[PDB]
């Protein structure tokens, strides 16, 4: 379910992030999506610790 | 889109919502255009919020 959250993006797939959206401005949106992602994945590793 | 991004016989071209480089790339349903003039004191106002 962590992959269906956007992060307070427009879309939730980085494609469509890299196809639809300026790069400018989409590398910040791709580090902010992978930076939540990551967040998450570190809050889950915890848990499993 | 070559005669709205590529080319430029219009003054100004803003893309919010959407990338204006890639406009050609992406596929929508239907548009719809409104057409209308303003004075130029008054054309900032044409963007969200």
Redesign the interface.
Do not use: E, K, Q
């Given at each position: 379910k962590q992959l269906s959250s956007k992060f307070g993006a427009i879309s939730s797939v980085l494609n469509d992030i890299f196809?639809?959206?300026?790069?400018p401005e989409?590398e910040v949106q791709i580090d902010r999506l992978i930076t939540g992602r990551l967040q998450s994945l570190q809050t889950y590793v915890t848990q499993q610790l | 889109y070559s005669v709205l991004y590529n080319l430029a016989p219009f003054f100004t071209f803003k893309c919010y919502g959407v990338s204006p480089t890639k406009l050609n790339d992406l596929c929508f349903t239907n548009v719809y255009a409104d057409s209308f003039v303003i004075r130029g004191d008054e054309v900032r106002q044409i963007a969200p919020g």
């Open positions: 196809s639809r959206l300026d790069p989409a | -």
